[PDB]
Curated annotation (Swiss-Prot), chain C:
Gene source species: Mus musculus
Single GO molecular function: NADH dehydrogenase (ubiquinone) activity
Name of the protein in question: NADH dehydrogenase [ubiquinone] iron-sulfur protein 4, mitochondrial
Protein topology in the membrane: Peripheral membrane protein
Modified residues (Phosphoserine): 123
Full protein stretch here: 51 to 175 of 175
Swiss-Prot record, chain E:
Descriptive protein name: NADH dehydrogenase [ubiquinone] iron-sulfur protein 3, mitochondrial
Main function: Core subunit of the mitochondrial membrane respiratory chain NADH dehydrogenase (Complex I) which catalyzes electron transfer from NADH through the respiratory chain, using ubiquinone as an electron acceptor. Essential for the catalytic activity and assembly of complex I.
EC nos: 7.1.1.2
UniProt keyword list: Electron transport, Membrane, Mitochondrion, Mitochondrion inner membrane, NAD, Oxidoreductase, Respiratory chain, Transit peptide, Translocase, Transport, Ubiquinone
Full-length numbering of the shown residues: 43 to 248 of 263
GO terms assigned for molecular function: NADH dehydrogenase (ubiquinone) activity; NADH dehydrogenase activity
Gene that encodes the chain: Ndufs3
Coiled-coil annotated residue ranges, if any: none
Catalytic reaction list: a ubiquinone + NADH + 5 H(+)(in) = a ubiquinol + NAD(+) + 4 H(+)(out)
Entry keyword Cell division: no
Keyword Mitochondrion annotated: yes
Main location: mitochondrion
Localisation: Mitochondrion inner membrane
Curated annotation (Swiss-Prot), chain G:
Family: Belongs to the complex I NDUFA12 subunit family.
Coverage span on the entire protein: 98 to 144 of 145
Subunit record text: Complex I is composed of 45 different subunits.
Subcellular location: Mitochondrion inner membrane
Disulfide bridge map: none
Gene for this chain: Ndufa12
Organism: Mus musculus (Mouse)
Function: Accessory subunit of the mitochondrial membrane respiratory chain NADH dehydrogenase (Complex I), that is believed not to be involved in catalysis. Complex I functions in the transfer of electrons from NADH to the respiratory chain. The immediate electron acceptor for the enzyme is believed to be ubiquinone.
Source organism, top-level taxon: Eukaryota
Protein name: NADH dehydrogenase [ubiquinone] 1 alpha subcomplex subunit 12
From Swiss-Prot, chain I:
Main function: Core subunit of the mitochondrial membrane respiratory chain NADH dehydrogenase (Complex I) which catalyzes electron transfer from NADH through the respiratory chain, using ubiquinone as an electron acceptor. Essential for the catalytic activity and assembly of complex I. Redox-sensitive, critical component of the oxygen-sensing pathway in the pulmonary vasculature which plays a key role in acute pulmonary oxygen-sensing and hypoxic pulmonary vasoconstriction. Plays an important role in carotid body sensing of hypoxia.
Interval of the full protein contained in this chain: 310 to 386 of 463
Localisation: Mitochondrion inner membrane
Stretches assigned to coiled coil: none
Subunit structure: Core subunit of respiratory chain NADH dehydrogenase (Complex I) which is composed of 45 different subunits. Component of the iron-sulfur (IP) fragment of the enzyme. Interacts with NDUFAF3. Interacts with NDUFAF7. Interacts with CERS2.
Signal peptide segment: none
Species the sequence originates in: Mus musculus
Similarity-based family: Belongs to the complex I 49 kDa subunit family.
Protein name as it appears in the record: NADH dehydrogenase [ubiquinone] iron-sulfur protein 2, mitochondrial
Binding site for [4Fe-4S] cluster: 17, 23, 38
Lineage: Eukaryota, Metazoa, Chordata, Craniata, Vertebrata
Null allele phenotype: Knockout mice show early perinatal death and major defects in the CNS, compromising especially the postnatal development of dorsal cortex, corpus callosum, hippocampus and cerebellum. Neonatal neurogenesis and gliogenesis are deeply impaired.
Length: 82, 94, 125, 687, 206, 114, 47, 106, 77
């Protein structure tokens, strides 16, 4: 019972190039598909990108997206959402 | 002047009284509450206003020393008086 | 006759300070802000280390300010953030650090108060 | 590179042209005396105390005003400079009053310190002094005008920053004096900085009158919560009591200024305070009890509730630690209806892109902008220092400023277009006489406040603004490092809630009404018992009892911002933290500690034991809330607008008026400003 | 002038010459010789030159610095070697005084000089008790001014003024027990230092 | 980095100095409860010695260990020679004070103890 | 006094009091400053 | 002479007192004057040095002549504004004369 | 000004308590020898350096002059 997704990423670093690509490519489509889902884009400086996904009764998971490409990031995103 | 509170305690020159529900009233039991009965805020009011023929007047309190620093007060505002911040005296321009 | 010991330095067991006051604390390293009341800057030149404040209650007898923290009036002075932080680590305190907020250089032109075209023109001399 | 070699006691310095002797001395580290000079005001040559000597020159020059020529050598501890300082101090203290033991500017007196350092030790003035009639110019500022040294700092501050033009010098010679020729009152959103700026105790603060002396005060460094700017502040305590509040230089936010409200509302932290846990009686009355009783009862009523029936509402002045704890609790209970008392569109990308609901242009970017556009806002009373930077630009760098909304008294002159929103689409199309400006003007800015989004027509206007921003960006060329769109809040906890994942509004609570409310700092009155079941168990957590506490079932006293270490965030994403100055009164505690212990009791033991752990939780949820003092760029407005363009909602006819029209309403906007018995004096005086 | 202090340069000359003398005899174990405005001679040295230098000054015929007027320590917590150590020495044949300084820290002790001057037997114990600085080759080294169970070095700059513990008699156990410190009037910290520079001659550069 | 040592070259020699000191203490302990009429039992005293030793176990620096050995020797001197008293020795057990409860709740309920 | 009398001023004690270290009219200290923090009192009627 | 107090709450006494024995707390009086609400001295902290009457710019606090004021409790030596004002009213006929004697030396 | 006054220094011969006793006695005597001279040669004039940035000013000057009052305030705070 997923309740929230939150991507944490960086800028001007390789680790987050795939995540920026994902954001430009497929984020509007994801939102319009499931609009009532909270997707929290959160960028900072000198982090290692992660995707914290939070389920119903107070649990959540995470996966490092460092040195990952846009297609792999979309793979992990769909894995989580599924 | 010392005027007593419901509890029977005298009030001070700064309005201090242990609330009737206060446990700190014990220290006064079998004893007293030291209070000064001479209130400056009234003793100075009992004094009259000085009059001067000059729009500026210097106050020191009495003796050159034994008083307070010489301060100069303006008396252009006939609406009210000119008070000294040290001694409390007040002057007028006539 | 020399030895090599590269491990981090600690003197906590020699300072004699106790656990409550060596782990339950939080120290602050900073430059005291200038008092906007005055325009002097001879106080924003040395770094200072202080502690977190704690309970400060009222004595029932006389109304004074009573405490139990013996490090409330403890302020230390340093000439360098590196030395301040080294001392903090040495002693064993978790520290927060602030940067030296220096004012910016400003362009001043007494002539700007009399321009023929600009808004900087002043209405009272 | 257009630089000049100058000498200060022999040492060489590189300085830009137009730079002054004072500035060069400062660049070396030396510091010239001052009475009439201030970095942020115009220059005057009145005090005559900055006088120094130039090698090979008979006359001493004024360091505040003389731009430094090439090759000059400046002698600062020379006999001539020192004799000049001695004479000037002699003259200053000739006619000064001996009021130092009555003068609340006693241990802070620049005149005292400079007389001791650069002045002599005795008087040769055996004549009679003068005295001056003392004015009355408000309830905040006390005027003893026989201490004015005629420096003009007040006049200049007023004319330039506060845009008032009501102070001045009437008369000439020693008979001259400062103030208003009449009994006018000086009541501005910025009146109160003349106090810090007056080098002497001629202008003082009536509240702080006679209460303390500087060498007694302990000084902590904290931030404001009254507004959403985050003005850096100093809290000066004495024996565990808050005595006053001062500014603190942050040249990217406030630059030595703060607002009347946040410098004279420290009295509200001493009245109508919650000191003990309270609970409903059997007679419906509120009565005192202990933390054990209250927390156990709340946890009991929590163990029999979940989902949409449990809800949380947060008002202004609440801390991100408390927010994240309440979320990490109501999420283990599976009630995600965590809401704010202030609103932001839930449509479009809403709270999903930080590029939104922010001042994407740094508050300092107004000093580089060219055109500014204001939508439904009185920034003069909401975030006044934003208006202050706007006027600073309007003065120095010839800024253009326009306002869509009601006719308002901005401290400066502005272009007025109309009170209705349709001008937005009008502009975007091109049937307006403002496209002409926007076309020739680069670096534009368009800022919109939450006071217009509080309407029902909240998202339509915002989407119109977004489309207009796109059209402007494509018409007048701009890079992707210059930002255009900006959102401005009146609330200090908003950005934190939105970055922690709250629902910006109360629509969810009006949709699926709850049976168990956690209301925290919600002294607004938006929600009440006319919107809930007859048996809603409600827990009020807060530091004042104003609106939401009486209509409560359990009350848990908490700690204000002068009594806790806690993060807040301003309209530009700058995370800042307070520092405890005075421990809370009595049984009051910290909100995150309260919620943690509550969960431990219920059986939902959280993993947060210390503030560092709570901050690491904040880091995991959003990693920006621990990079204090640092803003973080954003680059996803194209996607934001791509999405927001698909949101059909029509605007309405009624204009968009600001709720704060006159200074009468700047005061009394939060529970602290309602508790302050000085803000009441100011309101009364205004009316 | 009647309000200012006289100023004799003969002493400055003598002491600068003797500084050069001492420094060229001991180019090792020596650094930062300085004679001040008020005509006092300081010689800073390395912790390995204590006994060499003290012996030289005591025995050398030109020096005869026999009396150990004082031994002291000084805590400056902003320098890696935070414990300055100071020996104030006196010579009667010349009616002269001198200062010999070295440095130390925690874990980095100094060599004892009871072999040279026996007065130090107690001064060094006092330094160890107050600033926490060990000395090598000291017969007895133990608490001298503080209580027997005192844990701390209180003349440092980080040790609080009022301390960490407090004593009182308790009838239950019939002894003088120790406890944490709870005062009925917290000592007040007066912030006095002025914002305006008072001595330019010491103005540090930025 | 490189340093100058004190009374040791490595933690092994340091630990054997420590073990000699423990021998001395452990052996002397009962003579104290005998000379000065302490109420406690030798078991309590020895447990206290063990506790005060393990309180400084994480230590790694030979110098920080040699200094602790020095100070323990000072204390043992003060104790075997009757310079300390019943009071100074019983100042180790804290018989007249309750400790700060190691419970978030037991702290919260009474004070701001973090 | 007989030859050099004092200055006749009111607010000066006419009747002298001796040491009262233990008498019932002795000195008991207290704080002269009023309450600082005023609490919140709710009304005496529910909802 | 009017009967008005002299202390204007300037705190120089509190700032110079070596033993930190003077606690002061002031306010504006209903008649608009600088006057104290609280003035406490601890005789178990005073070293009797006179710096307070050296500093007072108005001759309001004076270390008088009396020395026979021993007690039986430690709580009768914590003075306050009331006790000190009573002592002033008590001993003014002597303090004034001694000050008239000595004020030309200071 | 000890350089302006005469007195003898008693020295011993054996380093014993008796010699030190006699030394202290003769010191008590040389003290009278010095006091006679100090009295006879007492000069007039001020008593504290007239540098009001170190030593406070007199009270009349404090209560009539601005600079003296500022110096008093700063010196006692
Ligand atoms: S401003 Fe006030 S403190 Fe400063 S010299 Fe004037 S009277 Fe004294
Ligand atoms: S009132 Fe104060 S700020 Fe204004 S001119 Fe006078 S001294 Fe300057
Ligand atoms: S005489 Fe007593 S009260 Fe006055 S300053 Fe000296 S120690 Fe303080
Ligand atoms: S007693 Fe004198 S020095 Fe002390 S605060 Fe009152 S007036 Fe100032
Ligand atoms: S600072 Fe130059 S004349 Fe005032
Ligand atoms: Zn007067």
């Amino acid at each position: 019972g997923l309740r929230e997704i939150r991507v944490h990423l960086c800028q001007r670093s390789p680790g987050s190039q795939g995540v920026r690509d994902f954001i430009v490519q497929r984020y509007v489509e994801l939102k319009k598909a499931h609009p009532n889902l909270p997707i929290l884009i959160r960028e900072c400086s000198e982090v290692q990108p992660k995707l914290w996904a939070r389920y119903a009764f107070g649990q959540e998971k995470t996966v490092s997206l460092n040195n990952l490409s846009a297609d792999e990031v979309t793979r992990a995103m769909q894995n989580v959402l599924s | 002047g010392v005027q007593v509170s419901p509890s029977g305690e005298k009030i001070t020159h700064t309005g201090q009284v242990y609330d009737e529900k206060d446990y700190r009233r014990v220290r006064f039991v079998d004893r007293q509450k030291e209070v000064n009965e001479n209130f400056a805020i009234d003793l100075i009011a009992q004094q009259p206003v000085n009059e001067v023929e000059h729009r500026i007047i210097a106050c020191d309190g009495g003796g050159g020393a034994l008083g307070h620093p010489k301060v100069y007060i303006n008396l252009d505002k006939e609406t009210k008086t000119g008070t000294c911040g040290y001694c409390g005296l007040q002057f007028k321009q006539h | 006759q020399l030895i090599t010991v590269d491990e981090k330095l600690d003197i906590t067991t020699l300072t004699g300070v106790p656990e409550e006051h060596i782990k339950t604390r939080k120290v602050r390293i900073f430059v005291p802000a200038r008092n906007n009341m005055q325009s002097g800057v001879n106080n924003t030149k040395k770094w200072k280390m202080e502690f977190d404040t704690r309970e400060r209650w009222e004595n029932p007898l006389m109304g004074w300010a009573s405490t139990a923290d013996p490090l409330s009036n403890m302020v230390l002075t340093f000439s360098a953030k590196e030395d301040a932080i080294a001392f903090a680590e040495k002693n064993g305190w978790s520290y927060d650090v602030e940067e030296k907020k220096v004012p910016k250089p400003k362009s001043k032109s007494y002539g700007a108060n009399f321009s023929w075209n600009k808004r900087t023109r002043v209405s009272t001399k | 590179s257009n630089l000049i070699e100058v000498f200060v006691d022999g040492q060489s310095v590189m300085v830009e042209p137009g730079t002054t002797v004072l500035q060069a001395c400062e660049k070396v580290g030396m510091q010239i005396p001052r009475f009439c000079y201030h970095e942020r005001l115009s220059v005057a040559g009145n005090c005559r105390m900055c006088l120094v000597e130039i090698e090979k020159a008979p006359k001493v020059v004024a360091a505040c005003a003389m731009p430094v020529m090439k090759g000059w050598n400046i002698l600062t501890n020379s006999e001539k400079s020192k004799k000049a300082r001695e004479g000037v101090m002699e003259f200053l203290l000739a006619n000064h009053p001996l009021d130092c033991p009555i003068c609340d500017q006693g241990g802070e007196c620049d005149l005292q310190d400079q007389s001791m350092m650069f002045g002599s030790d005795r008087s040769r003035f055996l004549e009679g002094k003068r005295a001056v009639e003392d004015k009355n110019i408000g309830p905040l500022v006390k005027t003893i005008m026989t201490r004015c040294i005629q420096c003009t700092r007040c006049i200049r501050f007023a004319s330039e920053i506060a845009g008032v033009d009501d102070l001045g010098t009437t008369g000439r010679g020693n008979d001259m004096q400062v103030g208003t020729y009449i009994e006018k009152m000086f009541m501005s959103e910025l009146s109160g900085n003349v106090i810090d700026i007056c080098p002497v105790g001629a202008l003082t603060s009536k509240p702080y009158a006679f209460t303390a002396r500087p060498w007694e005060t302990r000084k902590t460094e904290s931030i404001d919560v009254m507004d959403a700017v985050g003005s850096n502040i100093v809290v000066s305590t004495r024996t565990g009591e808050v005595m006053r509040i001062l500014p603190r230089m942050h040249e990217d936010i406030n630059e030595e200024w703060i607002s009347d409200k946040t410098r004279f509302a420290y009295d509200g932290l001493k009245r109508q305070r919650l000191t003990e846990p309270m609970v409903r009686n059997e007679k419906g009355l509120l009565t005192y009890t202990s933390w054990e009783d209250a927390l156990s009862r709340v946890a009991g009523m929590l163990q029999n509730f979940e989902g949409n029936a449990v809800a949380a509402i947060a008002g202004g002045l609440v801390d991100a630690e408390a927010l994240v704890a309440l979320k990490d609790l109501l999420n283990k209970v599976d009630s995600d209806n965590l809401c704010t008392e202030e609103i932001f569109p839930t449509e479009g990308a809403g709270t999903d892109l930080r590029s939104n609901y922010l001042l994407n242009t740094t508050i300092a970017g107004v000093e580089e902008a060219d055109v500014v556009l204001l939508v439904g806002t009185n920034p003069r009373f909401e975030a006044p220092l934003f208006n202050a930077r706007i006027r600073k630009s309007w003065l120095h760098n010839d800024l253009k400023v326009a306002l869509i909304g009601s006719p308002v008294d901005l401290t400066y002159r502005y272009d007025h277009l109309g009170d209705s929103p349709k001008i937005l689409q009008d502009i975007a199309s091109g049937r307006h006489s403002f496209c002409e400006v926007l076309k020739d003007a680069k670096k534009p800015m368009v800022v919109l406040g939450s006071s217009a989004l509080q309407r029902d027509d909240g998202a339509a206007i915002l989407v119109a603004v977004s489309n207009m921003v796109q059209k402007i960006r494509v018409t007048t060329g701009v890079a992707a490092e210059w930002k255009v769109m900006n959102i401005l809040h009146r609330i200090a906890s908003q950005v934190a809630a939105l970055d922690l994942g709250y629902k910006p509004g109360v629509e969810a609570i009006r949709k699926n009404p709850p049976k168990m409310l956690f209301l925290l700092g919600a002294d607004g009155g938006c929600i009440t018992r006319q919107d809930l079941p007859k048996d809603c168990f409600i827990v009020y957590q807060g530091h004042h009892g104003d609106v939401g506490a009486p209509m409560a079932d359990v009350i848990l006293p908490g700690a204000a911002y002068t009594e806790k270490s806690a993060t807040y965030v301003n309209t530009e994403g700058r995370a800042q933290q307070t520092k405890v100055a005075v421990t809370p009164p009595g049984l009051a505690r910290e909100d995150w500690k309260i919620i943690r212990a509550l969960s431990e009791i219920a059986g939902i033991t959280l993993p947060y034991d210390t503030l560092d752990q709570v901050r690491n939780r904040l880091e995991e949820v959003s990693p920006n809330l621990v990079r204090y003092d640092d803003i973080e760029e954003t680059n996803y407005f194209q996607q934001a607008s791509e999405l927001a363009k698909l949101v059909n909602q029509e605007v309405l006819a009624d204009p968009l008026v600001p709720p704060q029209l006159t200074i009468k309403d700047f005061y009394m906007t939060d529970s602290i400003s309602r508790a302050s018995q000085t803000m009441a004096k100011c309101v009364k005086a205004v009316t | 002038r009647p309000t200012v202090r006289p100023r004799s340069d003969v002493t400055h000359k003598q002491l600068s010459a003797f500084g050069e003398y001492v420094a060229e005899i001991l180019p090792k174990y020596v650094q930062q010789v300085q004679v001040s405005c008020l005509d006092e001679l300081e010689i800073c040295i390395h912790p390995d030159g204590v006994i060499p230098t003290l012996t030289f000054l005591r025995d050398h015929t030109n020096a005869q610095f026999k009396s150990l007027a004082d031994l002291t320590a000084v805590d400056v917590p902003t320098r890696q070697n935070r414990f300055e150590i100071v020996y104030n020495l006196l010579s009667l044949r010349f009616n002269s005084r001198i200062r010999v300084k070295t440095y130390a820290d925690e874990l980095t002790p100094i060599d004892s000089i009871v072999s040279v001057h026996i007065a130090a037997n107690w001064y060094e114990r006092e330094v160890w008790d107050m600033f926490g600085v060990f000395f090598f080759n000291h017969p007895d080294l133990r608490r001298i001014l503080t209580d027997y169970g005192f844990e701390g070095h209180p003349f440092r700059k980080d040790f609080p003024l009022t301390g960490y513990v407090e004593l009182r008699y308790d009838d239950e156990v019939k002894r003088v027990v120790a406890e944490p410190v709870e005062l009925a009037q917290e000592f007040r910290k007066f912030d006095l230092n002025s914002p305006w520079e008072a001595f330019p001659a010491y103005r540090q550069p930025p | 980095t490189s340093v100058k040592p004190i009374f040791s070259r490595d933690l092994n020699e340091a630990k054997r100095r420590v073990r000699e000191l423990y021998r001395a203490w452990y052996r002397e302990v009962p003579n104290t409860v005998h000379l000065m009429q302490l109420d406690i039992t030798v078991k309590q005293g020895r447990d206290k010695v063990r506790e005060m030793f393990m309180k400084n176990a994480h230590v790694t620096d030979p110098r920080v260990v040699d200094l602790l050995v020095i100070k323990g020797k000072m204390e043992l001197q003060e104790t075997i020679k009757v310079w300390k008293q019943r009071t100074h020795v019983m100042r180790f057990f804290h018989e007249t004070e309750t400790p700060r409860p190691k419970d978030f709740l037991s702290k919260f309920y009474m004070g701001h103890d973090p | 006094p007989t030859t050099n009398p004092p200055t006749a001023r009111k607010f000066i004690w006419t009747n002298h009091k001796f040491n009262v270290s233990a008498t019932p009219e002795q000195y008991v200290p207290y704080s002269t400053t009023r309450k600082k923090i005023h609490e919140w009192v709710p009304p005496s009627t529910p909802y | 002479p009017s009967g008005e107090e002299r202390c204007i709450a300037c705190k120089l006494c509190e700032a110079i007192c070596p033993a930190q024995a003077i606690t002061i707390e002031a306010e504006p009086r209903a008649d608009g004057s600088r006057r104290t609400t609280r003035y406490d001295i601890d005789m178990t902290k005073c070293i009797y040095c006179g710096f307070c009457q050296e500093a007072c710019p108005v001759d309001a606090i004076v270390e008088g002549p009396n020395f026979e004021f021993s007690t039986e409790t430690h709580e009768e030596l914590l003075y306050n504004k009331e006790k000190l004002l009573n002592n002033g009213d008590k001993w003014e006929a002597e303090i004034a004369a001694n000050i008239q004697a000595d004020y030309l030396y200071r | 000004v000890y350089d302006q006054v005469e007195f003898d220094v008693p020295i011993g011969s054996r380093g014993d308590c008796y010699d030190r006793y006699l030394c202290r006695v003769e010191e008590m005597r040389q003290s009278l020898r010095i006091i006679e001279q100090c009295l006879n040669k007492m000069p007039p004039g001020e008593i504290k350096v007239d540098d009001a940035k170190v030593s406070p000013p007199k009270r009349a000057e404090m209560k009539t002059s601005m600079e003296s009052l500022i110096h008093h305030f700063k010196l006692y705070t």
